[PDB]
Amino acid sequence: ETGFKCFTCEKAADNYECNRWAPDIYCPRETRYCYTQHTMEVTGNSISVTKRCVPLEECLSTGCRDSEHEGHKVCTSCCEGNICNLPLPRNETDATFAGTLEVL
Numbered sequence: 627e628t629g630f631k632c633f634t635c636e637k638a639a640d641n642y643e644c645n646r647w648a649p650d651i652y653c654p655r656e657t658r659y660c661y662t663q664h665t666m667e668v669t670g671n672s673i674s675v676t677k678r679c680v681p682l683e684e685c686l687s688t689g690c691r692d693s694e695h696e697g698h699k700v701c702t703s704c705c706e707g708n709i710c711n712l713p714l715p716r717n718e719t720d721a722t723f724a725g726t727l728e729v730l
């Protein structure tokens with residue numbers, strides 16, 4: 627891999643909007659991981675998506691939590707790897723800090 631790069635977006639409506647308009651640029655210096663936060667209805671529909679290049683300290687609170695807003699949950703993940711944060715986390719299992727199966 628060359629450098630560090632993530633899908634990035636601030637408060638996009640869904641994964642399509644986030645990824646389709648994500649700039650093809652490298653991460654800011656002193657970031658190493660790709661972060662994703664997905665606010666969704668518990669029934670499934672996306673409400674908001676934020677994706678960022680981050681340091682380690684932003685990746686220590688992953689999982690799906692209940693929102694103060696009734697009927698919403700917030701799922702947060704992080705990953706290591708070039709543009710690794712293409713998907714969205716939707717459940718506790720995938721709302722985690724992990725690598726990918728690109729290279730077995």
Ligand SMILES: *[C@@H]1O[C@H](CO)[C@@H](O)[C@H](O)[C@H]1NC(C)=O
Pocket residue numbers: 668669670671716717
């Ligand atoms: C995962 O999230 C979806 C969101 O629609 C939900 O339907 C499902 O109950 C959740 N849990 C599991 C174990 O899949």
